[model samples]
Target chain A: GSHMNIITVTLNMEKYNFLGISIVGQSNERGDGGIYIGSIMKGGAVAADGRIEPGDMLLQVNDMNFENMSNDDAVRVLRDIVHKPGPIVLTVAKSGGGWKWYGWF
Target chain B: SHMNIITVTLNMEKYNFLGISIVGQSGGIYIGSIMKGGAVAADGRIEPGDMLLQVNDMNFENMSNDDAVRVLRDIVHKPGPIVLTVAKSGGGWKWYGWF
Candidate 1:
C-alpha cells in the first residue's frame, strides 16, 4: 500500500528557481573549494515566490556559516529552523558580481 | 452476529491514480499470484500464464517499439481515456480503461 499527494503553495513561481548552495566533495578538498547553488523546481512552493532563483549562492542561514556544509547537513538545519519558526535569511550572489541577502517567511 | 456479503471483483482495475502497470505471463504468472495468495499481490486483470496483447486502443499486433511515458503521464495528469487491453490463452482480447 502506498499514498502520495501533491500540494500547491505560494512559493516557486519563476521559470527557474534557486534553493541554496552546498559545499559538496570530500573534506580533504582545496581551501574553501566546491560550492554551488542548488536550483529549485519551477512551480515549486519555495520557488514560486520571488524569494529564491537560479544562479544565487547561499551564504548563511540564521547567521550560521554555510561554507563547508554537506547537502544533508544543510537540509537538517533548514528543517530545524522550520520548526523554530523564524526568518530564513539567505545571502545570494547577484549577476552583477555582488552579494545580497533574501529572507523567507 | 450476521455475516455481510460483499462482492468485490478480483480483476485489476486501471491503476491510473498511481501511474503503474502489471504484466502476467507464463512462468511468474502463478495462479496463487493472480488470486492474491502468493508473495506478489494481484494487480491488473491479466493473471499468470496470460499474455498482454495491447495497451489503450493501440494494437500489439505489429508490436512496434514505442514509449508509453506520455500515455502514462496523461493517465496520471488527466486520468480519462486511459485503458488497457489484454488477451489470455484461448480467450479473446479484453479491454480495461479508466475515466
Candidate 2:
C-alpha cells in the first residue's frame, strides 16, 4: 500500500530571495517517479521557512504539475523560479508507514 | 528558448559505457540519473531527469520496469543507432545532439 501526505507552502521572495533546496527524482518499486527533496542548504529559505524537510516528495510547483515530469525538467523549473524574481509555491508529499500528524493549528 | 529534442546513437557492444540509468515510473521509462564521466555524460546531450519516451521507435508508454529493461537490453544487443526520444527541460520535446 502507498500512503502519502501532501503539504503546500509559499516562499515569499521578499523575505528570502532564493529557496535553498535540492531535489532528485525517485521511483518506488512499482516504478512511480516522484520529485524528492534531496537536501536543504543551511540558513536557506526552505530551512528558515521551517516547513519543508529533506525527503519530502514534490507534487507541484505553483500551477505546474510535476506528476509526470522528469528529474531534469523538474530541476529546471525550480531553477527558473529561483533565478527569477517571484514567490514560489510548492506542493510536496511525505510518505511514511506509521501514524503521523500533518497539518497546521 | 528551451527547444530540445535529442538523438543519441550508442554502441550496444558497450552498453555499460552508456553511463546512464533508467527508472520505470508511472508507466514510463525515465532517465533517473546520469553517472559522471559516463558515455551519455561525455556525449553531452541528455541529462538526468529526462524521460525516455521511445527507443528505436518503440514506445515505452505503459511499460513496466522489467519490460523496459528487457526492451533496452534488446536494443543494446542489436546494431545501428539506439534511437531515443526524450523529454527535456523547459518544456517542448526535441531531438538532442550526439557525440
Candidate 3:
C-alpha cells in the first residue's frame, strides 16, 4: 500500500440514465476545476456496477470532457446526452469530488 | 509475509469502506494499496504486493482478471465477515496441490 492509487478508472454503466451519484466540484478551469462523486445511491446502477466511488472525479463522459464546463453547464451537457444512445462510457479519475447527476446512457 | 487469512467486516448496507486498492494480473488479483483510514489499513496484516488467494470460497487461481475484479466489486452487495486469504509477495499466486 503506497500513495494515491489514483489513476483514471472507467465505469461501464451503459444501461440507461440515472447514474445514481451526487457530486460537487469547482470548474476544471476554475482554479482546479473538478467534479467529485459525493455519493453513490444504495440501489443505484453505478453502485451495482461498482467502479466509481464517492470522492472520485468525473473526467469525461464518452468523448465529452467535464473539465471545460461549469456545474450547470456540465448539467446541461450531461442532460443532452441522455436525450440523444447506447454504450455510455464514463471516464473518471480516482479522491476527487459530486452533483445529483446522471451520467451517459 | 506468510500466507495469511485476513478477515474484516465490510459495510454491506450501502458501500462502507474496506480501505483497499487492488490490481488484477494474469496470475491473480493483487493488493495495490491500503487506504489511510479504511479496514485494510487497520487490519495491518495485508500489504501491497500480495496476491489475493481467496475471497471467502472464491479462488482467483482459475478466474480471469476481469472475473476476479467483478467478484471483488460485488462483495459489497453482500454481507461481511469476509475472509481474504493472501499469499505473500514473491512466491506467486498459487501453489501446487492447493485447492
Candidate 4:
C-alpha cells in the first residue's frame, strides 16, 4: 500500500505534561479520517512542541492503539491522562490525503 | 541515495537569509520553501520537502521549530561555513523519531 510511514512522532511535553491535540474519528472504516488530529489548541502542549500538525493520525498513545477506539472510550482515555500524571506517549501517521484542499491556490 | 547531506554556506554580507521558511513537524524540521533569486534557491539543491538533519555539530532531532530557527539565526550570522545532513524523501520512504 502507498500508506507508508513518511514520518513518526512522539509527544513528551514537559510543561504540565499536557497534550493539546484534538482527534476526530468514531469508526475504523476506510475513507474516514482514522483518529487524526483535527486541530491543536493554542498554548497547549502539542502547540508548544511545535510539531504534531493537523491531519496527523494517532497510531498509539502510551502503548494503546488509536485505531478502532470508540469516541466515548477515547474521551475517557484522554481524561485519565490529562491530569493523572504518568507517561504520555503518542504515535501518529500522515498520508497524502491533503487536509481538504480548501486552499485558494 | 534517496536522502542526501547538503552543505550550504550563507554569505549574507549585506543580504538576508530569508530565502527559506521551515515548517517543523513530527520531530523533523523540513524545508518550508525557497524564494526565487535567493540564497537557498540559488544553491539549486535544497527544496521544500527536504528535511534538515544536522548543522555542523548541532543535531536538529527532537528540537522545536523555534529552537531550530534560533539555531539557524545563530549559524547564518556567523563567519563560518556549515554542513548539513539532509533527508530528502522520495517515493515510498518513511522516517520515525521522538520528541
The prediction achieving the highest lDDT against the true structure is: 2
Tens digits of per-residue lDDT for model 4, B4-93? 566665445534553766656545666645678766666667765577777778877767656766787788667665565678643121
Q: Candidate 3: misplaced stretches above 4 Å?
A: A1-105, B1-15, B90-99
Name the lDDT value of residue B52 in candidate 2.
73
Residue lDDT tens for model 4, A7-105: 444555566445766655533233333455656778776776666767676776676764666554655566666666654776667642333211100
Q: Which docking band does candidate 1 fall into?
A: incorrect
lDDT of each residue in A4-67, candidate 3, tens digit only: 4444434444553566776554422324345656567766557777777765766777788877
lDDT tens readout by residue for model 3, B1-99 = 345555544433333656676665344566755677566666667766577777778887788767776777677446675667787653212111100
lDDT of candidates 1 onward, in order? 0.35, 0.63, 0.58, 0.58
TM-score of each: 0.28, 0.45, 0.39, 0.42
List runs of model 1 lying over 4 Å from the truth: A1-28, A31-35, A43-45, A68-75, A83-86, A95-105, B1-99
The lDDT, on a scale of 0 to 1, for candidate 1 is 0.35
Q: Residues B1-99, candidate 1, lDDT per residue (tens digit)?
A: 113212212222443243223332221111111333221233344433233344456444454222233333344465343344434432121111100
Interface RMSD of each: 23.9, 16.0, 20.7, 13.9
Given candidate 4, what's the lDDT at residue A50?
68
Give the per-residue Cα lDDT of candidate 3 at B23.
60
State each model's TM-score restricted to chain B.
0.34, 0.67, 0.72, 0.69
Q: Please give, for residues A62-101, the per-residue lDDT of candidate 2 as tens digits.
A: 9988778765576677777777777788888874122121
Residue A81 of candidate 4: its Cα lDDT? 67
* RMSD values, in order shown: 19.6, 12.8, 15.1, 12.8
lDDT of 4 at B50: 74
What value of lDDT does candidate 2 attain over all alpha carbons? Answer: 0.63
